Curated annotation (Swiss-Prot), chain A:
Changing residue 78 to V: In NMAN; no effect on homodimerization; no effect on adenosine 5'-monophosphoramidase activity; no effect on affinity for tryptamine adenosine phosphoramidate; loss of SUMO-specific isopeptidase activity. It is linked to Neuromyotonia and axonal neuropathy, autosomal recessive: An autosomal recessive neurologic disorder characterized by onset in the first or second decade of a peripheral axonal neuropathy predominantly affecting motor more than sensory nerves. The axonal neuropathy is reminiscent of Charcot-Marie-Tooth disease type 2 and distal hereditary motor neuropathy. Individuals with NMAN also have delayed muscle relaxation and action myotonia associated with neuromyotonic discharges on needle EMG resulting from hyperexcitability of the peripheral nerves. GO terms for biological process: intrinsic apoptotic signaling pathway by p53 class mediator; positive regulation of calcium-mediated signaling; protein desumoylation; proteolysis; purine ribonucleotide catabolic process; regulation of DNA-templated transcription; signal transduction. It comes from Homo sapiens. This is Adenosine 5'-monophosphoramidase HINT1. Changing residue 86 to M: Loss of SUMO-specific isopeptidase activity. It is found in: Cytoplasm; Nucleus. Changing residue 46 to N: Loss of SUMO-specific isopeptidase activity. Changing residue 99 to A: No significant effect on affinity for 3-indolepropionic acyl-adenylate and tryptamine adenosine phosphoramidate monoester. SUPFAM superfamilies: HIT-like. Widely expressed. Changing residue 26 to P: In NMAN; negligible protein expression due to post-translational degradation; loss of homodimerization; significant decrease in adenosine 5'-monophosphoramidase activity; reduced SUMO-specific isopeptidase activity. Belongs to the HINT family.
Length: 115, 112
């Protein structure tokens, strides 16, 4: 099945419910069920890429699209004071699901370091 | 409005440069928050991700591909975290778009 069988692949195919914000032919934005900020959503490609460390050179446009969609959805959600975008890679990055995802967090002051 | 990152791109002040191409520059952060902490920045002056244009999409992806390749070159085989900060709530320190790449330790949750 297209997208794979991680929870994110299932969400892409409407097999597991999610609170969807935005969808286009390349990606999907939906709210994180364990939010770490007052607003916390994910932008994922529909194409299955397990982790950023294995993304291909020709995935540049798609990865950039995640960020453009993230910033547009953040504006649509009224995050007018700003936000933080995060991609986790692997164990040290805290990556929970092996399907590439961009976190977008806002609605409060984010702190430094970023974890 | 120019920034300190513009000065770094122009080679007017030093930084520990890791990689360069025709459209971006990667260099170690002067205030590292992990054993490895570097930045990938576009040479184009985009002040913040919120004003990035649609035509900038593949350039932004290029920052991430460069970041992941440099992370591998720097031995971050256990993983890493990529961060883009926007505005005051995001903690953005310089108004020139920059991708942070942090690793060499366990990164924690929440991410700030
Ligand atoms: Cl910053």
């Amino acid at each position: 099945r297209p997208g794979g069988d991680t929870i994110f692949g299932k969400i892409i195919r409407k097999e597991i419910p999610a609170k969807i914000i935005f969808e286009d032919d390349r990606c999907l934005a939906f709210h994180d069920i364990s939010p770490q900020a007052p607003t916390h959503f994910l932008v994922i490609p529909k194409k299955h890429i397990s982790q950023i460390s294995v993304a291909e050179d020709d995935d540049e446009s798609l990865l950039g699209h995640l960020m453009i969609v993230g910033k547009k959805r953040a504006a649509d959600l009224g995050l007018n004071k700003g936000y933080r975008m995060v991609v986790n890679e692997g164990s040290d990055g805290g990556q929970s699901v092996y399907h590439v995802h961009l976190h977008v967090l806002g609605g409060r002051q984010m702190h430094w370091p970023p974890g």
